Design an enzyme around this catalytic site. Structure first.
Site, PDB file in Angstrom:
ATOM      1  N   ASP A 142      50.339  46.243  40.096  1.00 31.50           N
ATOM      2  CA  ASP A 142      50.271  44.876  39.565  1.00 31.50           C
ATOM      3  C   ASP A 142      49.671  44.878  38.172  1.00 31.50           C
ATOM      4  OD1 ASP A 142      50.642  42.133  39.408  1.00 31.50           O
ATOM      5  OD2 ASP A 142      48.766  41.630  40.428  1.00 31.50           O
ATOM      6  N   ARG A 146      46.167  39.790  33.241  1.00 32.04           N
ATOM      7  CA  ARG A 146      45.070  39.290  34.070  1.00 32.04           C
ATOM      8  C   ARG A 146      44.252  40.436  34.681  1.00 32.04           C
ATOM      9  NH1 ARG A 146      43.947  39.208  39.740  1.00 32.04           N
ATOM     10  NH2 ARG A 146      42.206  37.739  40.033  1.00 32.04           N
ATOM     11  N   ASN A 147      44.870  41.611  34.792  1.00 29.39           N
ATOM     12  CA  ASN A 147      44.209  42.804  35.339  1.00 29.39           C
ATOM     13  C   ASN A 147      43.854  43.834  34.269  1.00 29.39           C
ATOM     14  OD1 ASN A 147      44.235  41.966  38.079  1.00 29.39           O
ATOM     15  ND2 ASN A 147      46.408  42.521  38.229  1.00 29.39           N
ATOM     16  N   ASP A 160      41.381  46.914  38.797  1.00 33.72           N
ATOM     17  CA  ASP A 160      42.038  46.749  40.095  1.00 33.72           C
ATOM     18  C   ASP A 160      43.192  47.733  40.306  1.00 33.72           C
ATOM     19  OD1 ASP A 160      40.265  44.759  40.789  1.00 33.72           O
ATOM     20  OD2 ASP A 160      41.654  43.093  40.453  1.00 33.72           O
TER      21      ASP A 160
END
Length: 282
Positions: A142, A146-147, A160
């Site tokens: 993913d 945002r990560n 993450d």
């Protein structure tokens, strides 16, 4: 949980502060993270189980902890600093990125504070981190702005990457509370055929590149998931964003090649972006 002296950190040397997000991650001060400075404070992030968590929740956090131990250190990922496993709740102590996630970093700086070379530097750094993760045979699954987190010194750190992900029960229609549709970052072979490789992460990097050069725009604007399915089956690709040079949109479209083997590798992406950085006017 067995004691790993190499990683164990006394929980009484932690002072827990404000939640960064909900297991759950909390900002904290740690004293003596550097053994040579036992009374010195440093700001860290502490991951822990939510209240009334299941045994599967515990297994997931333990899994992430173990992945982090094996991954090793790199400038452009969120690194493991320590763990608290004995006589108390499980804590996984991680580096804290002061400026928050890259998506919000970009949206808050729309004109402007952000110049082209610094945007390319953001992309280059993410590509370097992903090159490292690949070399450790870690597939993120993913990768998205945002990560990616941003330090006080504007260093990009991939976050993450070690999450226990349920790839066989992904909710494709899932919309997060911030309104994100994570399916919009999935490579077609992952979405349609449930196949993940480092090349599916390269697809995601292409989407991340588009996020960077739209200063945190949401991908496939105005397209709901049902339509995204049919559009992807027809070979739909995002348009070239405003104020984006053809070198960068070219890299995006390469990252989105239908054939995974024809996408660039992260090594090639690092090299391409380095070349753009060295071409910056002085």
């Amino acid at each position: 949980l067995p004691l790993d002296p190499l990683w164990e950190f006394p929980r009484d040397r932690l002072v827990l502060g404000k939640p960064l997000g909900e297991g759950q991650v909390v900002r904290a001060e740690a004293f003596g993270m550097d053994p040579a400075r036992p009374d010195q404070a440093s700001t860290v992030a502490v991951k822990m189980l939510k209240d009334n968590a299941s045994d599967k929740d515990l297994a997931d956090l333990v899994s992430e902890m173990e992945v982090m131990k094996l991954i090793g250190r790199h400038k452009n990922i969120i690194n493991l600093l320590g763990v608290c496993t004995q006589e108390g709740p499980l804590y996984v102590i991680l580096e804290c990125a002061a400026k928050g996630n890259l998506r919000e970093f970009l949206r808050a700086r729309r004109p402007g504070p952000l110049s082209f070379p610094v945007l390319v530097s953001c992309a280059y750094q993410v590509a370097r981190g992903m090159q490292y993760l690949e070399s450790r045979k870690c597939i993120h699954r993913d990768l998205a702005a945002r990560n990616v987190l941003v330090t006080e010194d504007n260093v990009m750190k991939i976050a993450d990457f070690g999450l226990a992900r349920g790839v066989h029960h992904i909710d494709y229609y899932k919309k997060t509370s911030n309104g994100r549709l994570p399916v919009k970052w999935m490579a077609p072979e992952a979405l349609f055929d449930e196949v993940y490789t480092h090349q599916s992460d390269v697809w995601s990097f292409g989407i991340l590149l588009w996020e960077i050069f739209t200063l945190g725009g949401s991908p496939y604007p105005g397209i709901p998931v049902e339509e995204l399915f049919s559009l992807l089956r027809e070979g739909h690709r995002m348009d070239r964003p405003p104020h984006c040079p053809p070198e960068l949109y070219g890299l995006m479209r390469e990252c989105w090649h239908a054939a995974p083997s024809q996408r660039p590798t992260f090594k090639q992406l690092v090299e391409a972006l380095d070349k753009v950085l060295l071409a910056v006017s002085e």
